[PDB]
Structure formats: structure tokens, C-alpha cells
């Protein structure tokens, strides 16, 4: 079987332009565990990106959280880019501050 990842891009605390926060990309519900995730700042990937240790839910699908520190602004656009065997092309989900 193969299950495609659900993708959520959001911040640890409410977004406030100029204040340091954490940009999170949470991928879940996928199988197998091979997945490549990038956090983008105006299209370029961010280098200091970490993630949780691979685990999974009761239905056996995996989940991983990728995060990085960032200081939101009005101009800077953020996003998460995910690739998995179930995806034809990498999927890009834009960070929306009200989601």
C-alpha cells in the first residue's frame, strides 16, 4: 500500500512581524517513510532545518515535523516543499498566517 502525506505549514506561536518564531511543516498520514521536505524562504531552501525522530500513528502511517527559527515580516513569503513516491512532482504548500 501507499498513502500520500497530508501537509501543514504553520508557526509555533502566533505570527507577529519582527518577532522570532518557529516555522513548522508537519507531514503525516504517509507510507512508506521515505520523504524529502524543504522549508523555503522566497523560493530558496533554508539550511538550518531540523526534524523529529520518525514515528507513526495507530493506523501505521508515519509523521515527521520539520522546523526552523524564522522572524516573519510582511514581505517575506514562506513555504514547505514535499516529495514522496506517491507524488508526481514536489508539492508546495504556502505558509498562511491564519491557518
Amino acid at each position: 500500500i501507499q498513502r500520500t502525506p497530508k501537509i501543514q505549514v504553520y508557526s509555533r506561536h502566533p505570527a507577529e512581524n519582527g518577532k522570532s518564531n518557529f516555522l513548522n511543516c508537519y507531514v503525516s498520514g504517509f507510507h512508506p517513510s521515505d520523504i524529502e521536505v524543504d522549508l523555503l524562504k522566497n523560493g530558496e531552501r533554508i539550511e538550518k532545518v531540523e526534524h523529529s525522530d520518525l514515528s507513526f500513528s495507530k493506523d501505521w502511517s508515519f509523521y515527521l515535523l520539520y522546523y526552523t527559527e524564522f522572524t516573519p515580516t510582511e514581505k517575506d513569503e514562506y513555504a514547505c516543499r514535499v516529495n514522496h513516491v506517491t507524488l508526481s512532482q514536489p508539492k508546495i504548500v504556502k505558509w498562511d498566517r491564519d491557518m
Binding site: 500500500i1 509555533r12 518557529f22 507510507h31 517513510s33 525522530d53 507513526f56 501505521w60 508515519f62 491564519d98
Partner: protein, 276 residues
């Protein structure tokens, strides 16, 4: 009942790219406390929670050996699993397992768990009696016959009823400030017009622990399950979780909607509405 300990193991073959990778993560409820990864430069059982750090050298070595030996066991299992399914040695596969126990408020065993899934499908599980097995197909029946014969269930049972419950009781006492603390969600409702005709009311739940929560919307006291968009509870990265439930409503009717929040860190459940 109020607590659980659980180990999540993933073993995945990768023909031509070395031996199958094995990673085992340990949890107490929604708090990870240990990790073991055969791919780490120097694989050892390592802390991922402050309260497990006080454990002596002996604790780390005994558990490092268990996970080193579990790596070989899982590798041998994947080999066997390929044969049971007449699978090619060219494909990549996944063996996953979850084992642990649940204890009540008094720390008494509520139930044990020991199950496996092959390539995402349930394969075999130790029943709640901690004495028999349930196999998913004829391949799993081979595993069942071998386990029945080696009296494996008796071994798992002693771990689930003895060792598992005792370490959970020890862990809970050592991390009582966090493990025994439920953090209530901070809640609020936002409102985003969509057109002149409708607007979205989103009910938020932030900073809560443990993950378990219930967010629902009612229009005129009626549950709106079919009409509510609910996101999966997500980790904030500070041990807490977040979640939201949204509903599209006709303009002018926002006050007919109420958001209901249930969480164990709340004395009585909440009822919120949009506050213009």
C-alpha cells in the same frame, strides 16, 4: 485510566543500500523520551526527555543492547517476510511494531499491546488476553505457529504485566511535573469573509497537552459534523499541540454558531462564539 508507554519500531529494507534501517522511538503518552537508530554514527539508546537523563550507565547499556539485538531480529524477520510473500529481493519493504502498556490512575495494568504491520497492513497482534494471537493472513499464520511453539506470548506477557508497568510507574514519578500535567488549550474564534454571502468561522485550540481533544461546531445546538472542516492535531514543537475546526456560515448568522472544546486540562468543557 490515565497513562501509557509505547515503543514504535520501524525497520525498512533498502536492497543495494546496506542493511535494513531500524529506528525505535519510546513514548510516555505524547512525550517522546528515547530513540535508537541503527543509522546513527554510533547507535545507542539516547534521551529525548530531561527526566530520563538521571538514569544510570547500566540503564543505557542494557537498553542499548536490547535495541541492538532487536535490530538483528527485525532484519531476520524482514528476510522471512519476503519468503512468506514470495517477494523479490529487489524490492524495499517495511516492518513496523508497537508494544507497550496502559495503566490506570493507580498505576494498575489496564491493557498490554504487541502488534506488527508489514508494508502498512496489519500482520499479527497479541490479543488482549496476553496469551493468544490474531494473524491477518496465511503468512502471519507461519509467524503464529512459530510463536505458539516457542511460547513467545508468555514472554511478552511477563514484559507487559511486569517490566513495562514498573518502568512506566518509575518514569511517571520522575517526570511528574510534565507527564502528570495537562495544559489546557488557549481558545478563540476568528472570522474570514469569503464573499458577500458567506464567511468562515475558525475555532482555535493552542498550547494544549496531551494531544487528545474534541473541537466541534453547532448551529442552533445541532452538531455540524458533515459541515465542519477539522485539521489533524499538529505538534507545535514545545511539547504542545494545536488544532482548528472551521465552518462556512451565511453572513449575519454567525451568532447561531457555537464552538465546543473538550480537553482533560479543562474543569468543565468550553463554549465559544465569534466576538466581533
Amino acid at each position: 485510566g490515565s497513562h501509557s508507554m509505547r515503543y514504535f519500531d520501524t525497520a525498512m529494507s533498502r536492497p543495494g543500500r546496506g542493511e535494513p534501517r531500524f529506528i525505535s522511538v519510546g513514548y510516555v503518552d505524547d512525550t517522546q523520551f528515547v530513540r535508537f537508530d541503527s543509522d546513527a554514527a554510533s547507535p545507542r539508546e539516547e534521551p529525548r526527555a530531561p527526566w530520563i537523563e538521571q538514569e544510570g550507565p547500566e540503564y543505557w547499556d542494557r537498553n542499548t543492547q536490547i535495541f541492538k539485538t532487536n535490530t538483528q531480529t527485525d532484519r531476520e524477520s524482514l528476510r522471512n517476510l519476503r519468503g512468506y510473500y514470495n517477494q523479490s529481493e529487489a524490492g524495499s519493504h517495511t516492518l513496523q511494531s508497537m508494544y507497550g502498556c496502559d495503566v490506570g490512575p493507580d498505576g494498575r495494568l489496564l491493557r498490554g499491546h504487541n502488534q506488527y504491520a508489514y508494508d502498512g497492513k496489519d500482520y499479527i497482534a497479541l490479543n488482549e488476553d496476553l496469551r493468544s494471537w490474531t494473524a491477518a493472513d496465511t503468512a502471519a499464520q507461519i509467524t503464529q505457529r512459530k510463536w505458539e511453539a516457542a511460547r513467545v506470548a508468555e514472554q511478552d506477557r511477563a514484559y507487559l504485566e511486569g517490566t513495562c508497568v514498573e518502568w512506566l510507574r518509575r518514569y511517571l514519578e520522575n517526570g511528574k511535573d510534565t507527564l502528570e500535567r495537562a495544559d489546557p488549550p488557549k481558545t478563540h474564534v476568528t472570522h474570514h469573509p469569503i464573499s458577500d454571502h458567506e464567511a468562515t468561522l475558525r475555532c482555535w485550540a493552542l498550547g494544549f497537552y496531551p494531544a487528545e481533544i474534541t473541537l466541534t461546531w453547532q448551529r442552533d445546538g445541532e452538531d455540524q459534523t458533515q459541515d465542519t472542516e477539522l485539521v489533524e492535531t499538529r505538534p507545535a514543537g514545545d511539547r504542545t499541540f494545536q488544532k482548528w475546526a472551521a465552518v462556512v456560515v451565511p453572513s449575519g448568522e454567525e451568532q447561531r454558531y457555537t464552538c465546543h472544546v473538550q480537553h482533560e486540562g479543562l474543569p468543565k468543557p468550553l463554549t465559544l462564539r465569534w466576538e466581533p
